[PDB]
Design a binder for this molecule. Structure first.
Ligand SMILES: [Mg+2]
Ligand SMILES: [Mg+2]
Lengths: 142, 23, 141, 24
């Protein structure tokens, strides 16, 4: 419900601040801090292993959601787990940072809406059947 | 074509972070 | 000429280190430090004002040079000054970081040569007629 | 191309601003 938008807005605020951007220029605690550290650890591994998550994606406002939906559908095509959820947040976070980087800051509120919608309809089910967000802080708590 | 590779790499590092944490 | 190439490699290794990359995986100290702080402030000023430097630049291993030459030739079309040189160094570093971000790590050594060649053949004349790099340090730092 | 034209332009103004600011 609203706790998912609370989590999505918090993560996007954190990732936008790492490059100097403020959330208001465009628009729980344990679960937030756990996702922030896990999302930070994920981006460092992805940049180390492969490349930047979005700089190679040639993103335009007309192909924004068109690219967002094909990535999250493939990521959760054959199941859902906690690490894949961390990959979901880090991808959408890196998408907003690229949107402001490419002068498309109108996409920040759109990506925020697309993520919170997918979290409620397609990931929140799996959240509850695996113990809720309390399991995420149990596993990613230090 | 680049999005399909990005989606792919997000899986592998997502499943690795999942299996690593679960042990 | 050798100090110019040593200046370019240092600034490129600095900007690459900020994004977690190492210089050796791909290929006076007051002048290095002054140019480093000037490039940081400039790139930070550019991101705040307009955008990322090279993200909108749809670069590819074949489009790298003839888009680099279009930017530097226009940057110094109507004169040279210290602030335009800081702009020149920052554009090269962002290009090198962008090349690694797009899995084009073969381009950083090419960009370092393109910058050093322009530094000697087109930028050093204005340096000697304007106090040298010593004037750049007493102004930045 | 069209972005490099804008990028070249933006590098000028910010570079000339850094020059005049440091000069004073
Ligand atoms: Mg696979
Ligand atoms: Mg970029």
């Amino acid at each position: 419900s609203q706790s998912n938008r609370e989590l999505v807005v918090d993560f996007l605020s954190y990732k936008l601040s790492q490059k100097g951007y403020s959330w208001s220029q465009f628009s729980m605690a344990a679960v937030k801090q756990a996702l922030r550290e896990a999302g930070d650890e994920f981006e460092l591994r992805y940049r180390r292993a492969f490349s930047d998550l979005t700089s190679q994606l040639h993103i335009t406002p007309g192909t924004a959601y068109q690219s967002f939906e094909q990535v999250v559908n493939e990521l959760f095509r054959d199941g859902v787990n906690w690490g894949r959820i961390v990959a979901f947040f880090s991808f959408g976070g890196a998408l907003c940072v690229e949107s402001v980087d490419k002068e498309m800051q109108v996409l920040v509120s759109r990506i925020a809406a697309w993520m919170a919608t997918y979290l409620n309809d397609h990931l929140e089910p799996w959240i509850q059947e695996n113990g809720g967000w309390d399991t995420f802080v149990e596993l990613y708590g230090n | 074509s680049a999005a399909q590779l990005l989606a792919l790499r997000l899986k592998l590092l997502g499943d690795e972070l999942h299996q690593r944490t679960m042990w």
